[PDB]
Structure formats: structure tokens, C-alpha cells
Amino acid sequence: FLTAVSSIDTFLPVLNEAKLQWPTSALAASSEELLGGYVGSQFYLQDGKYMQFQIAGSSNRCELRQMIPDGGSEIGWAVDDGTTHTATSSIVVPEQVDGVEEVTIMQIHSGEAPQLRISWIRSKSLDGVAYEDFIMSTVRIGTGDSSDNFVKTHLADRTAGAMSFQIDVKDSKLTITVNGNVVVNGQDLSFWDGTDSCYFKAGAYNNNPTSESATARIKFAALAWVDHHHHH
């Protein structure tokens, strides 16, 4: 039988602050249900150690969405509220099966748009450089479709071993740290000033596959939203 993520202590803090959306943004499991042992092939404990997400289908997801802690409702915060908002993770990205082309593994999202997606990418050129099998950040600085609305950055080549990420937002600026090294340093998020509906996400969100049957798979060794105010 499949082992539940809540059967160990590692992920209990974030599970107390998230709902699971699967296979779309529809509710699969509340925070209470996650803490109570919700499990399926889409969301189970691998190797006694990893919170593993799996999903097939274009634009489908198996993803945690940040909630107010202790049974609360959906959270919404602003890039310019003066608080530092932080998400941390340690992720093992396996080799992806044929047909999977991009898997979003962490986000900042709002009611209307993704401010930030960190994604694995099979193949893409950025600023005239071709990259394969790598982790990318995609930041929106507008809501349009033209390339001027996005800042897309190579973060790191995918590693077999765990890779650490940290996302920080403070005073309308974004920092992304990968394996302890700052890769994105103070990216401007001020376009989003006053949007009070932002939240963190993490898991597997499958983008532009070439086969809707192909199953994306992502293993988390750690995941947390870090509260700089220590509300207790």
C-alpha cells in the first residue's frame, strides 16, 4: 500500500499550511485531510523520505497551495506589504519521461496570474543560449503575452541529487537562492504592488506536454513557508 506523506514528521508544518489541488485546481485534500493521512499515487511518501507528486495531462497539477495555518482559508498577501515572504524547498527532480516538456515545481501566484514559476525544462533557448535539462525561473512583469512581459533565467542544470531553493519577496523585490547561491538578486515585482491575493505553491504542474498521458514526477525532501513574524 502507498505510504502517506503525513506518516513522518518532515512535512507536517507545510501540510498544516496548504491544501492539495489535483488533478486540476479543484480541491483534492484539505490541510486537515493531508495531516490525516490523505494518500494516492499522485501524492505519497517515497523512500520513507520524499513527498512525491505525480501528474499527467496538459495544465493539470498535483500541487500544494498556501493556506492560512491551522485549518484556515486561502491566504493572500502582497509583494509590497513590507513583510518578507519566504518559501524553502529541497527537491529531487528525476529524469522526466518522454512527452513531459516543462514541470513547474514552485510558484508565486495570485488571483489572476503567476508572478513566478520555477520549472524544470527539457530544452529551451534563453537570451541566445541553448540549455537542456535545467531549472528555470519565469517572472511576470506584466500581464501581456509578448516576451517583454517576462524575465526568464537559467537557475541551474538539473542534478540527480537534491537541490535547495529559497524564494524571498520583500518590498516588491524577489530573490531566488539555489544550493545556497543567490541566482536572482532583487528582481523587480513592483508591477504587482497592491495585489493582495498572492500565495505560494509547490508540487508538480505540467506545462505544454507533447503527450497528455506522460506522467511528470517530482520528489520533495523538504518544503516550508517560513513566517518571519512567528505567529503562534
Ligand X SMILES: O=C(O)[C@H]1O[C@@H](O[C@H]2[C@H](O)[C@H](O)[C@H](O[C@H]3[C@H](O)[C@H](O)[C@H](O)O[C@@H]3C(=O)O)O[C@H]2C(=O)O)[C@@H](O)[C@@H](O)[C@@H]1O
Ligand Y SMILES: O=C(O)[C@H]1O[C@@H](O[C@H]2[C@H](O)[C@H](O)[C@H](O[C@H]3[C@H](O)[C@H](O)[C@@H](O)O[C@@H]3C(=O)O)O[C@@H]2C(=O)O)[C@@H](O)[C@@H](O)[C@@H]1O
* Interface with ligand Y (CB under 6 A): 114, 124, 138, 140, 147, 150, 207-208
Interacting residues with ligand X between 142 and 161 (CB under 6 A): none
| Residue 65 or 140 having the CB closest to ligand X | 65
HEC assignment per residue over the chain:
CCCCHHHCCCCHHHHCCEEEECCCCCEEECHHHHHCCCCECCEEEECCCEEEEEEECCCCEEEEEEECCCCCCECCECCCCCCCEEEEEEEECCCCCCCCCEEEEEEEECCCCEEEEEEEEEEEEECCEEEEEEEEEEEECCCCCCHHHEEEEEEEECCCCCEEEEEEEECCEEEEEECCEEEEEEEECHHHCCCCCEEEEEEEEECCCCCCCCEEEEEEEEEEEEECCCCC
Q: Which of Cl ion, ligand X, ligand Y, none lies near 140, with the C-beta cut-off 5 to 8 A by kind?
A: ligand Y
Report the C-alpha gap between 6 and 108 in whole angstroms.
24
Site for Cl ion in 47-66 (CB under 5 A): 59
Choose the stretch contacting ligand X; rule: CB under 6 A; options: 17-25, 50-58, 185-193, 210-218: 17-25
State yes or no: residue 21 binds ligand X (CB under 6 A): yes
Residue among 119, 105, 196 at smallest CA distance from 156: 119
> Cβ 193 to Cl ion, closest distance in Å?
27
CA distance 84 to 96: 33
Task: Please state the closest distance from residue 18 (CB atom) to ligand Y, in A.
Answer: 19
Name the segment binding ligand X (CB under 6 A); options: 9-17, 18-26, 136-144, 174-182.
Answer: 18-26
Q: Does 65 bind ligand X (CB under 6 A)?
A: yes
Q: What x/- string results for residues 71 through 110 when contact with ligand X is judged by CB under 6 A?
A: ---x----------------------------------x-
Give the total of residues touching ligand X (CB under 6 A).
8
**Least distance (Å) from Cl ion to the CB of residue 154?**
22
Residue 124 binding result from ligand Y, ligand X, Cl ion, none, given CB thresholds of 5 to 8 Å by partner type: ligand Y
Q: How far is the CB of 68 from Cl ion (least distance, A)?
A: 29
From the list ligand Y, ligand X, Cl ion, none, partner contacted by residue 138 (C-beta under 5 to 8 A by kind): ligand Y
Torsion from C-alpha of 96, 157, 63, 126, nearest 10 degrees: -100
Name residues contacting ligand X, limited to 23-42 (CB under 6 A): 24-27
Residues in contact with ligand X by the rule CB under 6 A: 21, 24-27, 65, 74, 109
